[PDB]
Design a protein around this nucleic acid. Structure first.
Ligand SMILES: [Mg+2]
Length: 304
DNA sequence: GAATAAGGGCGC
DNA sequence: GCGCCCTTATTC
């Protein structure tokens, strides 16, 4: 199903000032929800958001983002089930790539001037498929050599279909007359507004950077001395920095939630935050095993 | 909206 | 790798 289908009628509500001409307006029955209202204009979906999501700590924003990911999965799966390569299916594939591989979206005007690439400006020459392994190799932002890879069956099968279309561009849609065009950043960003707004494409990189860091630390394992632990944190930041195509300083400062490092320094990793009851597991549906554990780790900061 | 057809993701 | 069952398109 779609997101608005799932979320599904017209003092707080008054302060939102939802335009009266909007049709089939829905409103949150709750002061906390990041999406406070949604409806349709004469033509398209319009939204009003919680102001704290348009000042929160990283751990707060990410816990809430993890709450939106199961809905994202339902919406993107629905779009992926379509036949051929219609716009929403190609955008769902691109959204999966943002999620699982932590791409920047990019833009045409930026790419044209800088001769560097992001997801929406990738060329066919930037990717290869070997069975279920999709590998990307491209010049990313600031000229950094970027490498990314995925293992998902659906991505691999559909990447092959995209590569069957005439080049040079990778992300194109075909209308089932056969008319062909690119998916540009503006169109993808509108799709994201629908399926995750008020969260944005950047939230995939902060969530994904934090997740990769947490996985790395769990896999490396805890250290007996805090000094030795801090060395592991240095290695972790540099690994995630390479994945994200950023400096270690920017990665530590803006991408990895420090809560993950706090827990590591106290000898706790993702393994320690696995669900302990059947409902605790069920509430993590639509998250990967490691994503679920990350959500629970971030939730421990609220608990204290 | 319902009945119909058939492509195709993802649980198994 | 199979195949249930969710998807869009078509017709009423
Ligand atoms: Mg098949």
């Amino acid at each position: 199903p779609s997101r608005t289908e799932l979320l599904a009628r017209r003092a707080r509500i008054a302060r939102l000032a939802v335009p009266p001409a909007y049709q089939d307006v829905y409103v949150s029955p709750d002061a906390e929800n990041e999406l406070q209202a949604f409806g349709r204009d004469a033509a398209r979906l319009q939204y009003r958001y919680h102001p704290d999501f348009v000042a929160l700590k990283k751990w707060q924003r990410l816990t809430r983002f993890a709450g939106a990911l199961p809905t994202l999965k339902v919406a993107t799966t629905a779009d992926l089930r379509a036949s051929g390569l219609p716009p929403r299916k190609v955008m769902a594939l691109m959204t999966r790539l943002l999620h699982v591989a932590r791409f920047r979206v990019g833009s045409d005007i930026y790419a044209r001037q800088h001769k560097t690439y992001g997801l929406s400006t990738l060329r066919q020459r930037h990717v290869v498929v070997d069975g279920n392994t999709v590998t990307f190799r491209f010049k990313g932002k600031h000229g950094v050599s970027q490498h990314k890879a995925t293992s998902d069956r659906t991505l691999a099968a559909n990447m092959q279909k995209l590569l069957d279309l005439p080049g040079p561009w990778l992300f194109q849609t075909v209308d089932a007359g056969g008319e062909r065009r690119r998916i540009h950043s503006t169109e993808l960003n509108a799709y994201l507004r629908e399926v995750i707004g008020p969260f944005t494409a950047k939230d995939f990189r902060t969530w994904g950077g934090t997740l990769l860091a947490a996985e790395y630390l769990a896999q490396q394992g805890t250290e007996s001395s805090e000094r030795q632990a801090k060395k592991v944190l240095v290695d972790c930041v540099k690994f995630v920095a390479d994945d994200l195509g950023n400096t270690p300083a920017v990665t530590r400062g803006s991408y990895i939630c420090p809560v993950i490092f706090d827990r590591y320094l106290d000898g706790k990793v993702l393994d320690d935050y696995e669900p302990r009851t059947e409902r605790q597991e069920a509430e993590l549906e639509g998250l990967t095993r490691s994503e679920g554990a990350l959500k629970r780790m971030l939730e421990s900061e609220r608990t204290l």
